[PDB]
Structure formats: C-alpha cells, structure tokens
Amino acid sequence: YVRLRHLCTNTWIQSTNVPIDIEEERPIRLMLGTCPTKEDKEAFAIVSVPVSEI
C-alpha cells in the first residue's frame, strides 16, 4: 500500500465518486479528487505488470 501526496500541493489523492463520463450513459471512469486531510482510507497499492505485458 502507499498514499500519494502531490509534492507541488501536499494534498492527498482521494478516491472521489465524481463520474467523469457524465455524457456516457454508463460512466466507467471516476475522477480522483484532492483531499486536504490525510484520510488513509484510500489505499493505492502497486502491482507488478507482467514482463510479457510490457
């Protein structure tokens, strides 16, 4: 797990439920918002991609 903080703003990267694909009937992408607080609830971990995939 890891918490991403914008070094240029010192703001947490929170998982915002804002639907970016408003125009689409069934949006698939949810915008990631700026959380001023250090809410560790959002857990953005890193998973190794397959070498063949790369």
From Swiss-Prot:
Tissue-specific expression: Expressed in intestinal crypt and villus epithelial cells.
Coiled-coil features, chain-numbered ranges: none
Residue ranges constituting the MIR domain according to the UniProt record: 1-49
PTM annotation: Phosphorylated by AKT1 on serine and/or threonine residues.
Top-level taxonomic group: Eukaryota
Function: Inositol 1,4,5-trisphosphate-gated calcium channel that, upon 1D-myo-inositol 1,4,5-trisphosphate binding, transports calcium from the endoplasmic reticulum lumen to cytoplasm, thus releasing the intracellular calcium and therefore participates in cellular calcium ion homeostasis.
Domain remarks: Composed of a large N-terminal cytoplasmic domain (CD) followed by a juxtamembrane domain (JD) and a transmembrane domain (TMD).
Assembly and binders: Homotetramer. Homodimer. Interacts with TRPC1, TRPC3 and TRPC4. Interacts with TRPV4. Interacts with SIGMAR1. Interacts with PML and AKT1. Interacts with IRAG2 (via coiled-coil domain). Interacts with CABP1. Interacts with TMBIM4/LFG4. Interacts with CEMIP. Interacts with TESPA1. Interacts with TMEM203. Interacts with BOK; regulates ITPR3 expression. Interacts with BCL2L10. Interacts with CHGA and CHGB.
Similarity comment text for this entry: Belongs to the InsP3 receptor family.
Protein name (database record): Inositol 1,4,5-trisphosphate-gated calcium channel ITPR3
This protein's encoding gene: ITPR3
Full protein: residues contained: 386 to 439 of 2671
